[PDB]
Each structure stands twice: as structure tokens, then as C-alpha cells.
Design a protein around this ligand. Sequence first.
Ligand SMILES: CSC[C@H]1O[C@@H](n2cnc3c2N=CNC[C@H]3O)[C@H](O)[C@@H]1O
Ligand SMILES: [Zn+2]
Length: 357
Amino acid sequence: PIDFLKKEELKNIDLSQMSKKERYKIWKRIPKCELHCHLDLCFSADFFVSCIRKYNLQPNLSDEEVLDYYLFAKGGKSLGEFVEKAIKVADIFHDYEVIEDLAKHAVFNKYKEGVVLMEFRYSPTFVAFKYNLDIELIHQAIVKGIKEVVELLDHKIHVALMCIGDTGHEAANIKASADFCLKHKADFVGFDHGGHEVDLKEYKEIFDYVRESGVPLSVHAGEDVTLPNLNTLYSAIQVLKVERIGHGIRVAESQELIDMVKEKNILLEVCPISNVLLKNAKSMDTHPIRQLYDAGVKVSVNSDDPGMFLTNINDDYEELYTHLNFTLEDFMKMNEWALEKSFMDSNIKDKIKNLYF
Ligand SMILES: CSC[C@H]1O[C@@H](n2cnc3c2N=CNC[C@H]3O)[C@H](O)[C@@H]1O
Ligand SMILES: [Zn+2]
């Protein structure tokens, strides 16, 4: 099915001749390596509404109202308002069946979008808390859902998992999450922190234990523009010794951090639309990915939470092309960096490079 663009062919495409719908056929055929996407918040509008109606969760609400009430598609005030609506959305984590269904839906849609390498991340405590589910059984449902789809797809998309410890919901427990990550070392390729952006320095020992056991780190940092300084970024880099940074857009505010990230070969996982919708960037026109890219910082393109925003990865490419003048060449380059920085087994990484790059 998917006829992926090859580096050789990029000179033959003239995007300026195409309508938006048309450019979408081009974005889909970019062989995409996506590093930053929350599985637990990865769904289409049709899937989300089906889940609400399945459990008769909002019988007083029309479809439009459900989406408005639960999601962030029209954006909101801050990372802070985001966390509060994420909590409502956990209304869908009703049982292990819907969770396995979600994993299947999410993998299948990434495949249809032209994603070839997909690292999903999820927070066990976030999925479990609402209906007090068992995290072992949650993780089994997700694993089984993923394996079913990839095998059905004759492994045309390669998928791995990262574990998230988080801050912001009632059952949040970073240590529990790290222990769980290590117990399932076999399934998890990385460990992350999300939710409220805190300075993770105070969890140094937990992150050192994870990292030293052989599980690399990529934490959310340098996202929230309401924080008074860049302490969280310094801690991620110097204390947690991360290999990648979720967002990292505030690196753009500091010449010293730009130098440090280049010097340390750290990649920033940029989620452009997420940044605009949470007001961490004024507009796509002024998004720091442009400045970061031009300064020599390694960056990749990510969707973050397709369910909360009601977008998919190809929306992010469209925005980058349209508002910030990125080229097909840039996109192939960012995707190869992302493959290079991926936490997946290197044999798998070799195949993908052979196949697409
Ligand atoms: C404490 S609830 C917020 C939850 O939603 C997750 N999250 C989803 N999208 C993002 C999240 N966390 C932090 N920054 C905003 C965005 O990247 C986070 O991992 C956490 O699991
Ligand atoms: Zn994220």
C-alpha cells in the first residue's frame, strides 16, 4: 500500500502546486519516525465518542458537547488546564477491553498516517486510577493490542513502549512507576516524566536507578512557559542525563542551553501543535522549532496527544510547511535523526534505515 518517498525523489515534488488535501498525500508518504506520542491520549474523535456512548457516560450530551467537555481541540489556558481535562478523559479507562481496543486503534491509525517507527508512551498510574484497575493487567492489554495489529500488518510499522511516571493526578507515584518500568524492562525502551513540569532533581536517585539499569531517559522539560526560570531543563540535562527531551522548546531562550544540547547530542522531541494549543508558543509562525533547527539543534516532529487535540502527525507537518517554510528535505532529515536517536533495538533500527533512508 504506502508508497514512501525516497531521498532521491524529493527533488521531483513541487509542494507549491498542491492543495492542502493534496499536500496531505505527500505528508503521509514521508516515512515517519515518531518519538513523542501518549498512547493513553491517542484516539480519533469517532473512537472517543464511541467509548463515551459505549459506557453511557454522557447521556445528556450531544457529540459536539462531549468533545468540548472532555478534550482540548480548541486549546486552553495552559499545561495546567490540560492536566485537568486529561483527568476527565480517564472516564474512558473503564475496563481492560477498551484499553486493548485503544492500543489497536492507535497503532492502526499511525500506520495509515505513514509512520514506520513509533515509540508510544503511557502512564500506568494515569490509566488505572479512575476505575482502580490493575496496572499489570493494563500493561498486558496494551501489549497484546499492539502485537495483534503489528502482526496483522506484517510488521509494516515497528512499535515500542515507554513508561511514564507523572505528576498531577491522584494516584501519581514516580517511584512505583520506575519499579514497574524495570520489572517490565523487556517491554519498555525508555522512562519518562509528564504531567506538571517539576524540577526532577529531587528524584535524582530514582532516575539514576532506572538509567543505570539500562533504560534511557527522555523527560518532558522546557515546555511550560509559565515557569520562572529554566531550572527543569538544566536538571533534565545535567542531573537526569537524558538522551532526549520532550518539547525542550525553551532551550531556544538560552544560548547556553542551545550549546549544551548540541554538544551533548541531545534531540528535542518537538510537538508543534501541542505547544500552540497549550499556549506554550504564541503561534505556529513564531514557534521556536525554526530557530532551534537553524541553530543546529537536532529536533524531530511529534503529535503528542492526537486524542486531546483531535489531530494526527500529518497535521504537524502541514503546519511546519505552511507557517514555518520547512521543506521535504528538512522532514527527511528530522526523521532520520529521530531514527538515530530512537530507543529501539539497533537491528530494528538498521532495517528501518535500509528500508526507508
Ligand atoms: C498528571 S495527568 C497529565 C497526563 O497526561 C500526559 N500528557 C499528555 N500530553 C502531555 C502530557 N504531559 C505533559 N505535558 C503536556 C503534553 O506533552 C502526562 O504524561 C500525564 O500522564
Ligand atoms: Zn507529551
